[PDB]
């Protein structure tokens, strides 16, 4: 009972309240002394919970631990031993994002006089010592350097004045390592490839520049909240604890490190001239601010309303254009490559909640950011343009589809395939998918009708206007009657690789079920047997897709759901879809968005399929080994169907890369002959959609290295195509030798 | 969850006055 009174009392310290933060900590520390005789065991694991799970409130809880230690030396030692215990647990379990929070906590405890600075310097020079380890991934060296550098904003001033002869040895080792790192992969992870207005810097190079500037600034940083400074008198007499010598858990093959990152930057101080001056990109204040806001989201992402309140109530020890930091952090996550920390739709609803809570400030910062993203689309990463499209359309659908389109009227004068007009076209198609065609024609200015989507109506080949001279017109009219007569399958068989039998069957079935998705899925299920018969040939599957497209080419949403349903019901397979995406009938729609949504949706189905059957094998293996014959015989049959699913996976990627290499090279010869530049807008999208394949599924494609290098991406290919493959090799190389 | 839904001041001031 009083435990619950202790927990909620520890978690809520430092929130909004009448009393000052220092008065609350001094008071709380006093009641934790009283209850400590009885509840020492529980108070200990609660403080270990918040040090692990609440890094945003870091300095609040280190001060609290600092007060208890000054008054109770044996409690301070038990706590530090628990931290060392947990830091080893985390590194063993490959939870490195959680381990940095513990290192950072240990480091800040030095300011609280709980840990002696020499012990902390010893641990850090064992961190940087990982740079000397040989036959280990760069991502391992990167993380241990990051844990050191990212703790210095809090503990930097103290460690340097106390020991600067051994700190400079550490800095010298750090700078040596940073200069010899390979940055060949950064382009795949940048949201914009342009260096202006804001370069997208590799995260360690950014952090390094930030720490060195803090060093030249005499380790004076004006953002971190340091409550322990008011308790100097109490904390000067405290007895320090010495950390044991730290040994980094060795690198095994099961080790998983955080992959590299690029710092998202779209704001400087000129974007909010009236207001608190914005910390620069190379200031550690910018680093701490964003790190904390990212952590607030990580803690409260599941509750949108709470998450927004915690972002708005974020305390600093100096004022900052907070609305600009929030928007930038939220877009930094939505555009993070390869994938955002959380599901994408969360960021749309989090921004609405923020608008509700700051209706006079945030909505116009958000709108200012939307204009900026639009104006920088030229070099925006295609994976990020897609997320920008999906967010903006979903955002607008929650705000009456109201937008100042006139501000973007200058895209009407450009090539329709340029980034801005293509962005607007995709946005309006997404808005239609959330509303309906006529609504979108009414809300856009009359000058934007060229970017509006075609009306989504099916095209029936054997309709009234059709000529009786068309092949199979007669049979098409027989099917049209039999379907409405509720005819069974065999009757349809008698009414009918033959392309025309597929053509008349599909044309008629889709036409008669066009009212909704429910009717189309019902039709496929009722006559499923028919599909499997005349579409068993691989070229038959291809022709089902070809015909289905001819009917619904004006309704991209219907095409995606039908392709999805036919895969799940085994009418077509993933290889048929892959070959369909690159067929000539889709060449005009190739650059459009819905095509790549379909392809990626098909890949995700394959990938999810392999994982399911791998877990079966990775369960039966557990039963045999954990329990301990007949089980080994069942394992032999699982492994056989793990291999068969893994080879269809590999074939799906090899088809995609083949067709990609083919359409790209033949475009490169067509440009060489005609004697013209290679960079077509079409070319930009194509080459970037190739890079998207490597980037989205880099963990699976890693298995195909030798095949890809030796059979597909070879010296003979144009240097423009190899450039993409070598970026992908640089990426996987950073995390694997 | 009786404690869980309270204000921090309410909890801190209840702990040190009561016991």
């Amino acid at each position: 009972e009083t435990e619950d009174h202790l927990e909620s009392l520890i978690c809520k310290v430092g929130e909004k309240s009448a009393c000052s933060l220092e008065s609350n900590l001094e008071g709380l520390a006093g009641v934790l002394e009283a209850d400590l005789p009885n509840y020492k065991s529980k108070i200990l694991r609660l403080l270990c919970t918040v040090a692990r799970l609440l890094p945003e409130k870091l300095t609040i809880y280190t001060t609290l631990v600092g007060l208890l230690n000054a008054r109770n030396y044996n409690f301070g030692g038990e706590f530090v031993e628990a931290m060392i215990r947990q830091l080893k647990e985390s590194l063993k379990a490959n939870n490195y994002n959680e381990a940095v929070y513990l290192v950072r906590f240990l480091s800040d405890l030095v300011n609280c006089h709980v840990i002696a600075a020499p012990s902390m310097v010893a641990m850090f020079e064992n961190f940087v010592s990982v740079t000397q380890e040989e036959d280990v991934p760069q991502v391992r060296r990167d993380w241990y350097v990051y844990a050191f550098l990212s703790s210095l904003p809090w503990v930097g001033k103290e460690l340097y004045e106390k020991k600067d002869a051994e700190m400079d040895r550490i800095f010298a080792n750090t700078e040596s390592y940073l200069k010899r790192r390979q940055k060949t992969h950064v382009p795949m992870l940048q949201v914009w490839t342009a260096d202006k207005p804001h370069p997208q810097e590799e995260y360690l190079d950014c952090l390094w520049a930030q720490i060195q500037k803090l060093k030249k600034d005499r380790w004076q940083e004006r953002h971190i909240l340091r409550p322990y400074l008011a308790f100097d008198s109490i904390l000067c007499e405290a007895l320090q604890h010495n950390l044991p010598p730290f040994t980094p858990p060795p690198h095994t093959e099961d080790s998983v490190y955080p992959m590299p990152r690029v710092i998202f930057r779209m704001f400087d101080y000129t974007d909010d001239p009236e207001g608190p001056v914005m910390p620069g990109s190379h200031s550690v204040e910018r680093f701490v601010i964003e790190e904390n806001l990212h952590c607030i989201i990580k803690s409260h992402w599941k509750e949108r309303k709470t998450c927004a309140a915690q972002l708005v109530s974020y305390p600093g020890k100096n004022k900052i254009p907070l609305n600009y930091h929030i928007v930038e952090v939220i877009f930094a996550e939505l555009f993070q490559l390869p994938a955002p920390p959380h599901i994408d739709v969360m960021y749309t609803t989090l921004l609405i909640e923020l608008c509700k809570l700051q209706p006079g400030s945030l909505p116009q910062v958000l709108a200012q950011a939307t204009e900026m993203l639009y104006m920088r689309l030229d070099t925006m990463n295609t994976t990020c343009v897609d997320r920008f499209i999906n967010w903006f359309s979903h955002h607008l659908s929650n705000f009456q589809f109201r937008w100042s389109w006139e501000d973007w009227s200058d895209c009407l004068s450009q090539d329709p395939e340029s980034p801005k007009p293509k962005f607007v076209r995709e946005v309006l198609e997404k808005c239609m998918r959330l509303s309906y065609h006529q609504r979108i024609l009414d809300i856009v200015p009359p000058t934007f009708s060229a970017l509006c989507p075609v009306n989504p109506t099916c095209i029936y080949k054997y309709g009234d206007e059709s000529s009786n001279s068309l092949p199979g017109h007669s049979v098409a009219l027989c099917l049209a009657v039999a379907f409405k007569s509720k005819a069974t399958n065999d009757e349809i068989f008698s009414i009918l690789f033959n392309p025309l039998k597929i053509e008349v069957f599909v044309q008629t079935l889709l036409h008669l079920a066009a009212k909704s998705f429910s009717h189309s899925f019902s039709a496929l299920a009722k006559f499923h047997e028919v599909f499997k018969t005349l579409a068993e040939s691989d070229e038959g599957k291809l022709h089902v897709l070809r015909v289905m497209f001819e009917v619904w080419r004006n309704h991209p949403q219907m095409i995606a759901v039908l392709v999805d349903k036919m895969i799940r019901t085994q009418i077509v397979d993933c290889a048929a879809v892959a070959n369909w995406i690159f067929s000539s009938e889709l060449s005009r729609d190739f650059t459009r968005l819905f095509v790549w949504e379909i392809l990626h949706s098909t890949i995700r189905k394959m990938n999810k399929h392999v994982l399911k059957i791998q877990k079966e094998l990775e369960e039966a293996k557990e039963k045999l080994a954990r329990q301990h014959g007949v089980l080994e015989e069942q394992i032999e049959r699982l492994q056989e169907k793990v291999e068969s699913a893994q080879s269809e996976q590999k074939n799906l990627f090899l088809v995609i890369f083949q067709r990609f290499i083919m359409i790209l090279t033949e475009h490169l010869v067509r440009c060489e002959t005609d004697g013209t530049s290679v960079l077509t807008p079409w070319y930009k999208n194509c080459i970037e959609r190739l890079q998207q394949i490597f980037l989205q599924h880099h963990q699976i494609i890693q298995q195909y290295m030798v095949t890809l290098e030796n059979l597909l991406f070879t010296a003979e290919l144009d240097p423009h195509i190899l450039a993409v493959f070598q970026q992908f090799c640089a990426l996987q190389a950073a995390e694997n030798l | 969850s009786k404690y869980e839904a309270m204000d921090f001041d309410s909890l801190l001031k209840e702990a040190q006055q009561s016991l």
């Binding site: 799970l53 599941k302 599901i343 739709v345 969360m346 999906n390 309906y436 | -």
Partner: protein
């Protein structure tokens, strides 16, 4: 910590289906492992296509069942959405609930699962009971409320 594990959008609502076959205990059991959501406060003109586009943003949709008026057999202003996995329905519960569709705030609730007869409004006129006691005029909800 209790605060960090908190999922206040995923918890069950006070609504319970009276036509459900069983007692409260086993209905609550079905709710906590259900992948199906009840979607309320829809415009009578909202189509299956619009619901697919919105609700797909949290995961893959297995089936959608539009609610109908038992007599007229027309859109009744609600539907059900069945996902393949529950995590996807949970995310629709957190982020899609309380947002707009056809410019109306929609409300999602966990459902015990679809069985025949649930697609029809239980109101005396054939529509939802919600629309029998309504007073204000609503264009997307079919005028006044009797």
């Amino acid at each position: 910590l209790k605060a960090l594990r908190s999922d206040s959008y995923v918890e069950l609502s006070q609504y319970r289906d009276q036509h459900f076959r069983g007692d409260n205990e086993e209905q609550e059991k079905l709710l906590k492992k259900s992948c199906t959501l009840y979607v309320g406060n829809l415009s009578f003109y909202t189509t299956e296509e619009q619901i697919y586009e919105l609700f797909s943003k949290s995961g893959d949709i297995k089936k959608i069942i539009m609610g109908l008026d038992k007599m007229k057999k027309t859109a009744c202003g609600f539907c059900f959405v069945e996902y393949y996995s529950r995590a996807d329905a949970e995310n629709a519960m957190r982020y899609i609930n309380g947002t707009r569709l056809d410019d109306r705030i929609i409300r999602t609730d966990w459902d015990a699962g679809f069985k025949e007869g649930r697609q029809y409004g239980r109101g005396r006129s054939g529509g939802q009971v919600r629309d029998e006691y309504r007073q204000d005029y609503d264009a997307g909800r079919g005028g006044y409320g009797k």
